[PDB]
């Protein structure tokens, strides 16, 4: 069968690279994943990220802080890539999010075979369904909200 | 009061950067844009890009070869970023193509206000309509302008449907 995952990332981007700060992913079965990268340089954060992203992060002793390799491994387990379920990825205005996600494996040719090479655009579905009314920058909170919006849109 | 632009990019992406090779854009009113960047390093190309993308590029002397700044300016004009129509960007999937297009303006904060921050995905629209049988993929698919043209043709079939 098919399982949908809704995700969001926070990152530092400068028109050239995208340095991942955090990633939240929620499956439609209710499972949740959240991690913060130990490998981004907070000194490179612009004012917006420094004031709206970085203060919401966990304290530094939290086990939520993980290396990029750990996050990759954690996502391979979370997405159940070794099993037979098919995977759909969804994000809201997530072009950069998709890149940040794929770059945890490398070039998009390094993606595990069962992870799709594109992320469905939740904003597109929303508009396609006539922009139904939905409810009123932490990545797991945002990912959770995307799932909630999908279920409303598709109800 | 809205105009749809269908686009494709070709690039060298290595898990860190996305270095633009070319971009093709087709407006649903028939207008076309195509340019090839003078700034990507062809030696950095992988074997797949070397065989499928590079040989379809135009000769060095072609006026199609342009700087990144020039492509930006050209796109500001072509998309009519200061016009009254709203702009819709469409591509087969967006993601890497959307980042490659938008990095023409540098960081996300510098994208002109009227350019949308997402690209509508034809692949998603095609699936949402029940995966209708489509025409075959054309002769030179990894020529960015050929790709964009074909995307518009598909969009029209997917939406000029009986539903
Ligand atoms: Mg986001
Ligand atoms: Mg492309």
Curated annotation (Swiss-Prot), chain A:
GO terms for molecular function: 3'-5' exonuclease activity; identical protein binding; magnesium ion binding; nucleic acid binding; RNA exonuclease activity. Residues 8-11 are annotated as: RNA binding. Inhibited by EDTA. Keywords: Exonuclease, Hydrolase, Magnesium, Metal-binding, Nuclease. Pfam families: Rv2179c-like. SUPFAM superfamilies: Ribonuclease H-like (SSF53098). Exonuclease that cleaves single-stranded 3' overhangs of double-stranded RNA. Has no activity with 5' overhangs. Has negligible endonuclease activity. Can bind ATP, dATP and AMP (in vitro); the nucleotide occupies the predicted substrate binding site. This is 3'-5' exoribonuclease Rv2179c. It comes from Mycobacterium tuberculosis (strain ATCC 25618 / H37Rv). The lineage of its organism: Bacteria, Bacillati, Actinomycetota, Actinomycetes, Mycobacteriales.
Curated annotation (Swiss-Prot), chain B:
HAMAP family: 3_5_Exoribonuc_actinobact. Binds 1 Mg(2+) ion per subunit. Residues 8-11 are annotated as: RNA binding. Exonuclease that cleaves single-stranded 3' overhangs of double-stranded RNA. Has no activity with 5' overhangs. Has negligible endonuclease activity. Can bind ATP, dATP and AMP (in vitro); the nucleotide occupies the predicted substrate binding site. Member of the DEDD group of RNAses that are characterized by the presence of four acidic residues in the active site. These residues are conserved even when the proteins have highly divergent sequences. Has high structural similarity to RNase T despite very low sequence identity. Keywords: Exonuclease, Hydrolase, Magnesium, Metal-binding, Nuclease. One of its GO terms (molecular function) is 3'-5' exonuclease activity. InterPro entries: 3_5_Exoribonuc_actinobac (IPR030853), RNaseH-like_sf (IPR012337), RNaseH_sf (IPR036397), Rv2179c-like (IPR033390). It comes from the Bacteria. Its cofactor is Mg(2+). SUPFAM superfamilies: Ribonuclease H-like. Homodimer. Its EC number is 3.1.13.-. Pfam families: Rv2179c-like. This is 3'-5' exoribonuclease Rv2179c. Mg(2+) binds at residue 8. Inhibited by EDTA.
